[PDB]
Amino acid sequence: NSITVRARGVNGQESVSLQVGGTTVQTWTLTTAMQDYTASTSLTGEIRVAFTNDATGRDVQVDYIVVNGQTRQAENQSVNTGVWANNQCGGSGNSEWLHCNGYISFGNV
Ligand SMILES: OC[C@H]1O[C@@H](O[C@@H]2[C@H](O)[C@@H](O)[C@H](O)O[C@@H]2CO)[C@H](O)[C@@H](O)[C@H]1O
Ligand SMILES: [Ca+2]
Ligand SMILES: [Ca+2]
Numbered sequence: 001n002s003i004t005v006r007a008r009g010v011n012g013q014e015s016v017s018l019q020v021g022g023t024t025v026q027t028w029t030l031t032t033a034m035q036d037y038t039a040s041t042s043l044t045g046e047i048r049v050a051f052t053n054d055a056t057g058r059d060v061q062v063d064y065i066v067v068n069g070q071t072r073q074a075e076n077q078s079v080n081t082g083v084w085a086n087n088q089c090g091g092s093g094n095s096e097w098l099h100c101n102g103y104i105s106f107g108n109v
Contacts, residue, residue: 004066015053021045050103060098079105
């Protein structure tokens with residue numbers, strides 16, 4: 001099961017973890033350019049991309065992921081617990097942004 005994450009940070013210290021069924025597959029430190037990050041698992045289950053090290057000046061943007069060849073846009077996902085929206089952390093879904101610690105759920109593998 002191949003999973004590619006296309007993502008960037010605002011300052012390049014930002015850390016994201018790819019999780020599958022509650023298991024952490026891989027963790028990466030992002031750069032300020034949108035770039036691809038790839039991982040693989042034999043596991044199935046819910047995919048999450050989690051921003052874990054929010055601090056003054058850090059924000060994550062996930063464009064999309066690609067799961068076994070199939071594109072899933074971050075902005076088409078309904079659960080986003082880190083976006084700043086409606087004047088609060090995790091204030092909406094359907095966003096590329098994780099401003100606060102939180103994750104975007106991309107559903108089952
Ligand atoms: O509430 C603390 C929270 O704020 C975040 O920033 C939001 C928003 O993302 C910015 O665009 C806006 O300029 O400022 C607000 C808060 O005033 C932030 O990204 C988080 O890391 C938290 O600190
Ligand atoms: Ca996108
Ligand atoms: Ca932030």
